[PDB]
Amino acid sequence: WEQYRDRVNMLQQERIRDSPLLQAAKENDLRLLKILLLNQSCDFQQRGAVGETALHVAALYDNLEAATLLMEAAPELAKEPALCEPFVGQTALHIAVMNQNLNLVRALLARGASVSARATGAAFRRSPHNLIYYGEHPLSFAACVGSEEIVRLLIEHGADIRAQDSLGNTVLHILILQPNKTFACQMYNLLLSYDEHQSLELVPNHQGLTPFKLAGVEGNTVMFQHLMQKRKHVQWTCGPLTSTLYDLTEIDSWGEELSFLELVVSSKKREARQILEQTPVKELVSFKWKKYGRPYFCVLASLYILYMICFTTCCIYRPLKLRDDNRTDPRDITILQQKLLQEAYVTHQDNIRLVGELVTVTGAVIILLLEIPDIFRVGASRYFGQTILGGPFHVIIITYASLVLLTMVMRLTNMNGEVVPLSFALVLGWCSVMYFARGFQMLGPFTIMIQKMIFGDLMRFCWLMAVVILGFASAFHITFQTEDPNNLGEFSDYPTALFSTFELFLTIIDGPANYSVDLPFMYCITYAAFAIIATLLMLNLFIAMMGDTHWRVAQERDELWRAQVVATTVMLERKMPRFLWPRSGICGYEYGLGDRWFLRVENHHD
Amino acid sequence: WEQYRDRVNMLQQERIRDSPLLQAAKENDLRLLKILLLNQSCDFQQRGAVGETALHVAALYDNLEAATLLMEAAPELAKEPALCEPFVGQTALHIAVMNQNLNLVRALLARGASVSARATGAAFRRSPHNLIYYGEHPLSFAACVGSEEIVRLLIEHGADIRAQDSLGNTVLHILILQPNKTFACQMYNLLLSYDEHQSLELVPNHQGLTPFKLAGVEGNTVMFQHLMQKRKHVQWTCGPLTSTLYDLTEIDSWGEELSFLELVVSSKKREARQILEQTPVKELVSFKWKKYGRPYFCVLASLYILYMICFTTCCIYRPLKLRDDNRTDPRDITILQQKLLQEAYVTHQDNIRLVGELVTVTGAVIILLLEIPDIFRVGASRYFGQTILGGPFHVIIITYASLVLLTMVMRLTNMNGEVVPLSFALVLGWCSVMYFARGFQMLGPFTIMIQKMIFGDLMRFCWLMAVVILGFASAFHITFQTEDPNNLGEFSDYPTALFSTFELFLTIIDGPANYSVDLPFMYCITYAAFAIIATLLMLNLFIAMMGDTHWRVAQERDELWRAQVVATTVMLERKMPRFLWPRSGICGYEYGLGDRWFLRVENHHD
């Protein structure tokens, strides 16, 4: 990590300092350099810590004169790379190109340096440890530093433009992976000037991503917008309005199983949801949602609501009989118990409950056979972690299906205790109805904010709240274990003390006070303290935290709801059959553009 | 104070007005001045209220001609200081320098004025009464007014640059103690031009503070940032990225027991936490926290959590026996009492509680032997007042250790009433778990907010809330002392009336209403008034106060949490042994910089 870089820089400066030729290349004294290069006893392959030559040290400090005398004395230093771990394939040409010393680039290319050298060291791979990712080849380095003369001078000296690094990225892929600057857009066009003929636009990297698809994934809105300037065809401009015919070949992806929209919307980048607001994409997903996605989603929502109604009705009419044994014990109030399977189905209403329970198990298995292929296809971390795709709703529908199958297992083999998985199944299944709230303007962002404040604010409150509950429950249990439990039984034992002071924290029960007896004064003192610092302070400031968090994330949830109706639309196609989802757009056979399908957008501008 | 300054200005103007020579120096009439200076009967030492000469009055009103005539008639006025209390070392050279009358400075230095005169008056000491602090020597005065010609003209006329005032400050120390202006940075470099050789940078004042350390303490971010321009060494700039080698000699302070970071973070200045965000300091404390401070802090947090689990389990299983005497009295519900020490330890579970209680007392004494040296070393006001160092958590851990030792004292010598210190110990110790919330992004600033409204907002609410509780408790006790206490006993006597209307203020109990009896109409009227002006008005506006206060201090708590993880990191070193905390940075032996240890930072800039 960072200490490895500090140690290798320490060893680099030590081997530079203890060697006279590398030090003479470092601070560039000409006389000692001429004295050392007038010697002919040994070849000049003396190296530093990473295996860098003296020409690497000359190109590192922009020592042009030192580099000219080193390749005058030994012209074989241009073909020698560094050898050790952080710089495995770095040559002097990479250092000369990336420092933008153009005459040094001419001097290295005049002596025959390798133009297709892959700098496969650990300081050049795409990692969060490295601050930049300029690629491996010097062509990608010259494309990334933004010098047109150096990248052209590499082009007539070689520099095969379809070369790939160890991650599979070509030069345009690395140009997409840059901070959004001025030169990064026309350097793309300058390298498309030398494409001259399959192309460079249609070659993927090792993730299988087109540069159009990679620009969609990485959130590069400027590069995507300027790539869609070359894929549109204006028809006419009849006054203040024009009709643009955008191409949907690389956006819609009708016959390709990883679509472009699925790659955009299932991305771990924050900026990738901005591309869903771009002018060929937004009208496409708006047409797909308003024509097909919204009525099918409202049909599936009503079907799931009716299936919850059937499951709730089958829960309510559960077969329960009278308790066989006598209680013979105070404090216990259970009077009913579960019927055995031999007696659970004897009447007509039990047969109605039987066919409703097979409807429930059928709904459970068609949830599981619909979601387990989505577990196996899309990666299991991205399926649950992405709140755009509906990750928490997916994990609660998976555990709801698991709990209702476990209840059916405990119904066939007679096991007491169906109350616990039935109550978890009812809570999680009815909370899964909020997945269908995302299709509405009114309900979607509110459901987003309840996920943002379960995930962000509720844990922040509860890791202090449980501390206060533990301390004051211990204090209440000390001050009320010497008293009669039949008068104030709120703190009779420690689980009841924890639960009752949790309810006193949330103020959902009354303060325990019995005016017919004398409570201890210590309870009054520590309950006055508890009511001051928890009900008055922490609850109202939790209201303040949720208000300020709502005000800050209110700008993000409005554009993230529109980013997840696109995820809903992409989910609704390729799962329902193709006859319900026709191809979006119109064919370009009549326009003379061929087999490609196009989107016509009518746009006025003054 | 201010009236002393008004009285001494009153006496100054009276002695100037009643003397003809000082008045002639004041409004500068040349003819009466020549008439008075043509006399030779008496020596010209007539003084004002503070002992100021006529040359002081001439230099006060920028009377250059009058001052040249006074030192023409009597050239010994240049060596005469004012004598009384607010100006006891002030000469005419201080007034000439600080008014920036440069020809007057030439005229004073031509006649032989004292260049090393210490102006030790009460108007020149570092006090909140004085509006400026320009030092004592005229060299510091010329450095502070920002005139380069006057400070140079003092340099070839003398003005020993290592001179110290009565507070111990040298000239650079006083330049640090200035408002951040233009000239205050290059006046520092201009006085470092004549350092020429143990230097001026390494001399401390009477607090033992280096000017680097004083610039760290006083919040001077500009002076600190420009002091690290001279203590950094760039290695190379290989394209868009450079590698800077900052010095950690005066920052880290490995072998010095008052470290620089401890002087910065335990400071009573608001701006001193900004220096923790500077480019040599922030990476140092980030490396120290993310490598060593966070896992050791999470180990100590889990150890203290397990210690409180042990203390809570020892509290829950407290030895209590049945009450020996009969109650023979209604309204009393206590049935258990404390076991004596002869019968408290008879079984195996009592032996488990015994070894847990010795674990508790061992934890208490290793809290006390860890904190009482921090009471004695760092000053006791700064240890509790600083919320960055954990002041409230320190005082509650001190009183928690005191209460659990008092409980052990009451356990060896049999005294009834262990409930009160056990309940205070449980509340304060479980709230002392919350000191470990500062090591997390999620939990730290929320705990900062709750201490900011213990000390800021809860006092503001309760000094009105207790007034409303007192008035309405008195009203409820008057309207319910003529009634039967067995029907509505909420206001049967006055402590119950105070406590019950406190609960009615916080709405943690129901409104007392018995529909089987006729309550007085006066209770209904004053309870409608109480529910209008307290539950509806003051509670919701306390929510509004804490919301608006949260929005206002939300900018400061985010940079104050990052300022107190530095305090946590400085606390974690020099207390744990040195083998767990290795030296941060890398040695500069390989770089040729010597014994000093350096921090390598990799920084990209376009």
Swiss-Prot record, chains A, B:
Keyword Ion transport found: yes
Residues forming coiled coils: none
Example of a GO cellular component annotation carried by this entry: plasma membrane
Record's keyword annotation contains Electron transport: no
Membrane topology: Multi-pass membrane protein
UniProt PTM: Glycosylated.
Interaction with S100A10: annotated segments: 566-570
Effect upon mutating D510 to E/N/M: Attenuates Ca(2+) permeation and Ca(2+)-dependent current decay
Effect caused by changing F393A: Decreased inhibition by the synthetic drug econazole
Activity regulation summary: Activated by WNK3.
Positions on the Cytoplasmic side per record topology: 1-295, 377-387, 438-460
GO terms for MF: calcium channel activity; calmodulin binding; identical protein binding; metal ion binding
ANK repeats by residue range: 16-46, 50-79, 88-117, 134-163, 167-197, 207-236
Ranges of the Extracellular topological domain: 317-353, 411-416
Keywords carried by this UniProt record: ANK repeat, Calcium, Calcium channel, Calcium transport, Calmodulin-binding, Cell membrane, Glycoprotein, Ion channel, Ion transport, Membrane, Metal-binding, Phosphoprotein, Repeat, Transmembrane, Transmembrane helix, Transport
Binding site for Ca(2+): D510
TM region(s), chain numbering: 296-316, 354-376, 388-410, 417-437, 461-481, 525-545
Ranges within the bilayer without spanning: 492-512
Catalytic reaction list: Ca(2+)(in) = Ca(2+)(out)
Quaternary structure annotation from Swiss-Prot or TrEMBL: Homotetramer. Probably forms heterotetramers with TRPV6. Interacts with TRPV6. Interacts with S100A10 and probably with the ANAX2-S100A10 heterotetramer. The interaction with S100A10 is required for the trafficking to the plasma membrane. Interacts with calmodulin. Interacts with BSPRY, which results in its inactivation.
Similarity annotation: Belongs to the transient receptor (TC 1.A.4) family. TrpV subfamily. TRPV5 sub-subfamily.
Function description: Constitutively active calcium selective cation channel thought to be involved in Ca(2+) reabsorption in kidney and intestine. Required for normal Ca(2+) reabsorption in the kidney distal convoluted tubules. The channel is activated by low internal calcium level and the current exhibits an inward rectification. A Ca(2+)-dependent feedback regulation includes fast channel inactivation and slow current decay. Heteromeric assembly with TRPV6 seems to modify channel properties. TRPV5-TRPV6 heteromultimeric concatemers exhibit voltage-dependent gating.
Protein name: Transient receptor potential cation channel subfamily V member 5
Organism from which the protein derives: Oryctolagus cuniculus
Organism taxonomic ancestry: Eukaryota, Metazoa, Chordata, Craniata, Vertebrata
